Amino acid sequence: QIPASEQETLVRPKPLLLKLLKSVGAQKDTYTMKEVLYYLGQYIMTKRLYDEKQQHIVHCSNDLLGDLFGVPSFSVKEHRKIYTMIYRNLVVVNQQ
Numbered sequence: 001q002i003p004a005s006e007q008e009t010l011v012r013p014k015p016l017l018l019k020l021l022k023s024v025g026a027q028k029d030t031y032t033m034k035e036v037l038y039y040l041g042q043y044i045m046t047k048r049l050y051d052e053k054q055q056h057i058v059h060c061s062n063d064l065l066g067d068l069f070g071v072p073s074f075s076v077k078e079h080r081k082i083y084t085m086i087y088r089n090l091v092v093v094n095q096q
C-alpha cells in the first residue's frame, strides 16, 4: 500500500506529461517518482534545454516542459519547486 521511500511513490502522469516522457523512450504508463525525474532528464538532455554557461538553469519558455511546469525557466537545484510542478502533472496510484 505505502511506497518504500518517497522516491518509490507510484504515479500516473497526466496526458501531456505522459506524451513528454514517452517522446524520450519511456514505455510505461505507471512510474516511480525516481523514473519521472529520470525521463524528464532524458528530455532536457536530448532537447538541450539547459544554458550552456549555466547548466543548472533549464530554459523551457517555448517548450511543452515550460507549459506543463508553468515557468519559463527554473533551477535544477530547487527540488521543492520542481516537485510542486511535477505533482500538478500526475495522479498518485496504488501498488496493484
Ligand SMILES: CCC[C@H]1N(C(=O)c2cnccc2C(F)(F)F)CCC[C@@]1(Oc1csc(C(F)(F)F)c1)C(=O)N1CCN(c2ccccc2OCCO)CC1
Pocket (backbone or CB within 6 Å): 007, 034, 036, 037, 038, 040, 041, 042, 044, 045, 049, 050, 055, 056, 057, 058, 076, 078, 079, 080, 082, 083
Ligand atoms: C547530475 C547529472 C544528472 C542530471 N543532469 C544534469 O543536472 C545536467 C547535466 N548536464 C547538463 C545539464 C543538466 C541539467 F540541465 F539537467 F541540469 C542531466 C539530466 C538528468 C539529471 O537532471 C535532471 C533530471 S530531472 C531534472 C529536472 F528537474 F529539471 F526536471 C533535471 C538528473 O537525473 N538528476 C537527478 C534528479 N535531480 C532532482 C531534481 C528535482 C527534484 C529532485 C531531484 O533529485 C532528488 C533525488 O532523486 C536532478 C538531477
